[PDB]
Symmetry: C2
Subunit: 96 residues, 2 copies
C-alpha cells in the first residue's frame, strides 16, 4: 500500500486536492485522508463506479487494461487510481 | 470551436500529448488533430464512455453535473471535455 501512499501524496501536493481515500478489494475503505465519513461515501460509490470502468476498458480493448482514472465535475473534481488490489480517491477543488 | 481552441492549444503544450479530436453533440468529430480515422474511433467510443459518468455525477447529486473527463490506460491517457455542445479529445502519454 506504500506505493499507493506515493500515488497519493502526489495529489496531496496538487492544488485543490483536499483529501484522498484508499480502499481495498473487499470494497471497504482501509485508510481515509478526509473528514471521517467522506471515505465511507466514496467507498460505497466511487468503488462501484471505477469498477464499471476497469471492465469496460476490456470490452473496447482487453489489451489496454486500466491503471488510473480522472473525472472533472462542477462542485469540484476527483482523481482516482486503482492499484493492484486497492484503489485511491482525490476530492480536489478547481479554481483555488 | 474557439473557446475550445483554447481548451485545446493548452494540451498542445503538454508533452506526451500527441494529438487531439473535436466532436459536437450529434457525435460527429467536427475537427481532428490526429490520424484520419483515429478520430472516428475516439469520436464514436469516447461519447458512450463519458456518458456512464455524466449519469453517475447526477445520481450522487443532480446538482453537481459533470463538466470534463480524463482517463489513463496502459499506453497513455485520453483527456476530454464536453463544452456547451462541443466535446474535445486528447491523447497524451504519462511517465513524463
Amino acid at each position: 500500500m506504500a506505493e499507493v501512499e506515493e500515488t497519493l501524496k502526489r495529489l496531496q501536493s496538487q492544488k485543490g486536492v483536499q483529501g484522498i481515500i484508499v480502499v481495498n478489494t473487499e470494497g471497504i475503505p482501509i485508510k481515509s485522508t478526509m473528514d471521517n465519513p467522506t471515505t465511507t461515501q466514496y467507498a460505497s460509490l466511487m468503488h462501484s463506479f471505477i469498477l464499471k470502468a476497469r471492465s469496460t476498458v476490456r470490452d473496447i480493448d482487453p489489451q489496454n487494461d486500466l491503471t488510473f482514472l480522472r473525472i472533472r465535475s462542477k462542485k469540484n473534481e476527483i482523481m482516482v487510481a486503482p492499484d493492484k488490489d486497492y484503489f485511491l480517491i482525490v476530492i480536489q477543488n478547481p479554481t483555488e
